[PDB]
């Protein structure tokens, strides 16, 4: 019983495999891809992430020990704790992403066999078309992030080359940007998994709307029960996704919080002390935009899933109003109403957050408060 | 199938059309008004808002570049970021109001054909009388805001005339007050749309109260089902209104937050440094009152709609208690109870906020915190 | 159809009538008291509150104008805004309590005729005994508050007598303590109304527990329907109480917030600048305790009502589990379950707050934040 | 009708009895332990806690009065209010734990007779095995905390021995660490009671999953009703546990808040003024970790219970989808669905908090805000 997969989870799964976030074999059997746990590639992922974290920590220690005057990035005693936190938070995020990738892939393989059964009753062509449309956004975001990483690395290398520390700065911050790449790939992987589930739930909503209200290929009485079972399976898959990614999700959220606190602090420091390096200002603005984009990538698929659940409730209420009174197609909708009341399809990472648009407002308020706190502490 | 409309959406729709927030043709067919998308007036609205935003940005740049000593409004380096934010937030609010007006009018025309069907089963005379009562408040609020705008503009013009910059200040801040007018008209338009829907839902509540409990013109068994379908249509219209105005609503909320942070800062600065211009103090107090009134205009209709939904729940519970046990008028109320449990009628702009009275407390607390933060930063 | 009343609303209603918070006639007909609107006593209440507010404002103006050095209470420029806010917040609270007393008494008379019908099906002796037990707490709290008011007034009078301003200070702060008395009486009136409704709902819970589970005087099938109607009436009375007292409740909550922000500020100022007047420290500690007691008086009855509602849910779940399957006493409990799901018995003043124990934590956190803000501003 | 108990509540109940948190007799009848109220041991617990609190307060007073220069712990005027709060908060926590232990043991004995009936229908061997697995964690945490207490006490004793105040410091802080031991034992007692109830509810979930979906020993129709009654009893036990421990829970939560505010302040003070005592830094880091562990011990069992309730909802939805339409095993699941909708199994201490993972985020944010407030106040 191989776990066939294709479309979105055929390209980003290979990218994550290359960067160590998806230790899966990729047998080319059939048109789709048969994925399975690849013990031996998990060891490679662990070795890669451990080497990157060790190199990043050693480079951070060397950059702290080289001195405030000599360092080009840490040109202040206060601009050493913030940069150290910046480095360590992405190190922790990449570690959580890789140290836990085998378990996440095991859960993914577990719910593959259920989501394929769900797709068979809806049409795999629609899911394949929707998943192939997310590859363009995947490539665009990955290319933008990689270009920003390369530009930042080159800028700092040329700045350190003036004082004859270009190779030292390259050695110290080589693994930092690889950890950035790993973190971004993990975020995109979660986002596209959630978007695939959202596409499945949208297909479920369309089927519930068009079949339960009289194109049909089935009586609506049996159709409502089939859709109820399908929604239970979809809720199971949503819970598995939320459980697998919960720790990476909370770590990514706190990393975005810390980064939206730190980067504006650096921009303000530059515009108040130097106003000299326009490249630094451009990079700081790009990094603030990138952190906002990361937050959006994390929170938007979950909000869309919640909106699709609300649409499910809307469709079900309309169907119950249009349903014949006291007929067979009135107790089948009662069971679905009880299901909708008992269960909501939402992403709660580790039970702390809710992963919705209201979470963005709270994080932005905390960012503003901690930013003004740092500004007061600097002065 | 023309979208007939009249009463509230016959006067403020013409005002919004004049200011570019409602690109609709206004054929005088029948007693009411037949509205439709008016491609060619949407182009006029886009040109108008683009010209206003360009003029406002150019005037802001000129006022920043004229110097702290020369400028009469920006008489401080710190009183340049706050004034720039003040200008740009209303520029963004007006842009969002106009760049998106055709789509909002399309959604409005979409739910017109449903809300007229809802009104036909309740009585168009009541809705026309209720909508005509909102025109007096519309005229009062618009006149008050326009008088305040004219007074502020004249005050600043006379202040700049002392240093020979009256025409310069007029050129720099001509479009700023037009953007204020557009923002206020957009707020009033949303408020009166929400109030019209609240009036419809109040009529629905009265019908549910008087018909399901034995003036009738219909058996209560069929009446409960008809009212359930009506409530589903009303929920659909509420969702369309919330989706159309969601981005303008969140932009208006953040603009009110920023303005309630900024205006008391200016008032405190004046009372601590000058205590000379009584006109400035009067204007600052009037502007604080106006921002509070704007917040109330935004949040009160949604709170009233939520209160009407709670009244619907109350009436339904009373009806279920009074209903005969095991009769036909017991499962019809079960469907309505399930509908009420699954669906609540509330305005959630873009999914972030909830647009209720509790939102006022949070915004006021944030206003106080950021205001004391600015006061600390000034000293 | 006179509105007979006795017990709790026979003593505190006379106290509130004396202080202008209950303009009701008190015909001694029957053992209980027949209350009705007393137009002519409402005029007396309005005149009394207007005179008190005018005297308080004039005294505040005179105390501000007498000078920082001459004033014994306002011995600082910063300790003039806080004291002015302290005075004006209780002035506003007393005004809201009295300007609105006739409408609150009208709503009270409206729900008297329903709550007496509720009591007749439960036993008026229990309600009379429970309401008579609240009179001891009423007298204790009123006596404690009056003693504190008299002690504070005497302390300030003797302090001003040293500089020959005892009669001036008496004239300036005569009405301030009368406004305190009015505010405290209003708080106690709301608290005891809510406690009476809580006692009624507790009787309802006991009846539901002992009658629906087989002392009975009625079959349980009809008993469940009677209790459902009773709970609907109790929810109506709760909503009327919340609507009548909502504005006084929110004003009292913000007054307690401001006072818990102000009084510790005065205590800290004294312990850092003088450490001389032990009477002042004792009074400040007593006032902090009094503000906490006021907060508890406001929030505890609502929390107890919510707890009684949760107990209702618990009892109903136990009854449904113990009920025969498919019998007549299974759909009667279904209606009650739907009623409990649709309606919760809670006090939401004007829709902003929730009036529960969690509200205490938020208010205390805001108190701490604003207190440390004032401490930072002083230094 | 003795209350037989064993496993977890056979070892920690003896530990709590020794430290005064469980005044119960421990007759060795049968394999398990028969516990009952032990009037005479409650007097011993009261005497012990009163003596400890009096000694702690006297030692705190002596340490404040010995002088800033002489004291080794309070080497600052500002580092006297924070240390006094540190001491008094654990004194209050231990007092609440012991002053209230007889009532908590009475409630525990009350719900013992219900939870044993619940266990009999599930299998006492599973509960005994699960409860015996918590003893290893109990011993580990108690040993770690005792080792930390002894190390801290010895460190401070040797530090005071340099200035010839080792016996004085021992006398002053002897009871402080005993109060710490009592607080930790109370936290572990609550945690293991909650974990035992979680194990019972997990057994209930497994039985509902395997029996209602066709190993059985009973038809599923009667099984669903039996499980509904069992869940009602489990909710009753959860409510009794939450009511008994509510005040200790809120006191422990505020103590953890205050300690996570205070300990990082001491660590920062040391790293900014001395950087000399590495033992002090190690102890401060260990104490921060211990306070975080205490918070986790408090909040994790409740979160696991809520997760088990969500799993109950999931299982019930799956069963309703798989249940035959219109059969007997469709209305039995309707009653259970109504039970799940009306009741959630959660720990709300005194009604203020919710005791979940989201509570950790709020407390951590408050910790950060108050910590930076103290840092600003120090400078
Ligand atoms: O300048 C601050 C920005 O730079 C980075 O450290 C990457 O080099 C980002 O983590 C941060 O947002
Ligand atoms: O003085 C501040 C006030 O002035 C305005 O800029 C209008 O001229 C408002 O935006 C603001 O509330
Ligand atoms: O000292 C402050 C205290 O004194 C009062 O003004 C009463 O005289 C209270 O409002 C306040 O809590
Ligand atoms: O140093 C601060 C730490 O020390 C203690 O007082 C114990 O001696 C703890 O309460 C606190 O976390």
Automatic annotation (TrEMBL), chains A, B, C, D:
A molecular function (GO) term: ligand-gated monoatomic cation channel activity
Membrane topology recorded in Swiss-Prot or TrEMBL: Multi-pass membrane protein
Subcellular location: Cell membrane
Principal place of residence: membrane
Any Gene Ontology biological process: chemosensory behavior
Transmembrane segments: 4-22, 43-61, 81-102, 134-158, 178-197, 249-272, 359-377
Keywords annotated in UniProt: Cell membrane, Membrane, Receptor, Transducer, Transmembrane, Transmembrane helix
Signal peptide span: none
GO CC terms, sorted: axon; dendrite; neuronal cell body; plasma membrane
Domain of life, per lineage: Eukaryota
One Pfam assignment: 7tm_7
List of residues binding beta-D-fructose: 73, 86, 263, 284, 291
PANTHER family according to UniProt: GUSTATORY RECEPTOR FOR SUGAR TASTE 43A-RELATED (PTHR21143:SF123), INVERTEBRATE GUSTATORY RECEPTOR (PTHR21143)
Functional summary from the UniProt entry: Gustatory receptor which mediates acceptance or avoidance behavior, depending on its substrates.
Family: Belongs to the insect chemoreceptor superfamily. Gustatory receptor (GR) family.
Full protein name: Gustatory receptor
Gene behind the chain: Gr9
């Amino acid at each position: 019983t191989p776990c066939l997969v294709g479309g979105a989870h055929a390209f980003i799964l290979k990218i994550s495999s290359f960067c160590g976030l998806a230790p899966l074999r990729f047998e080319p059997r059939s048109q789709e891809y048969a994925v399975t746990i690849s013990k031996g590639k998990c060891f490679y992922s662990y070795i890669l992430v451990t080497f990157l974290v060790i190199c990043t920590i050693y480079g951070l220690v060397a950059e702290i020990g080289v001195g405030v005057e000599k360092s080009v990035r840490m040109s202040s005693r206060m601009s050493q704790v913030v940069s150290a936190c910046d480095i360590l938070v992405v190190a922790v995020t990449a570690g959580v992403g890789v140290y836990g990738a085998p378990a996440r892939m095991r859960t993914m393989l577990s719910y593959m066999e259920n989501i394929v059964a769900v797709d068979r009753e809806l049409g795999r062509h629609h899911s394949a078309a929707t998943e192939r449309k997310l590859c363009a956004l995947l490539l665009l975001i990955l290319l933008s992030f990689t270009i920003l990483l390369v530009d930042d690395f080159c800028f700092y290398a040329m700045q350190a080359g003036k004082t004859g520390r270009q190779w030292e700065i390259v050695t110290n911050y080589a693994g930092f940007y690889f950890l950035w790449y790993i973190v971004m790939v993990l975020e995109l992987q979660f986002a596209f998994t959630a978007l695939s589930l959202r596409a499945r739930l949208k297909l479920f909503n369309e089927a519930l709307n068009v079949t339960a209200s009289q194109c049909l290929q089935v009586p609506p009485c049996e159709a409502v029960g089939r859709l109820s079972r399908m929604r239970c399976t979809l809720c199971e898959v949503t819970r598995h996704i939320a459980d697998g990614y919960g720790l990476p999700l909370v770590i990514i959220l706190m990393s975005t919080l810390l980064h939206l606190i730190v980067t504006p602090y650096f921009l303000i420091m530059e515009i108040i002390v130097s106003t000299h390096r326009l490249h630094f200002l451009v990079l700081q603005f790009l990094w603030c935009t990138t952190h906002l984009i990361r937050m959006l990538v994390v929170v938007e698929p979950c909000h869309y899933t919640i909106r699709e659940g609300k649409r499910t409730e809307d469709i079900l209420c309309r169907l119950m109003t249009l349903a014949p009174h006291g007929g067979v197609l009135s107790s089948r909708l009662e069971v679905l109403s009880r299901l909708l009341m008992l269960q909501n399809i939402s992403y709660s990472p580790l039970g702390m957050c809710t992963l919705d648009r209201p979470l963005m407002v709270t994080v932005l308020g905390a960012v503003t408060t901690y930013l003004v706190i740092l500004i007061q502490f600097q002065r």
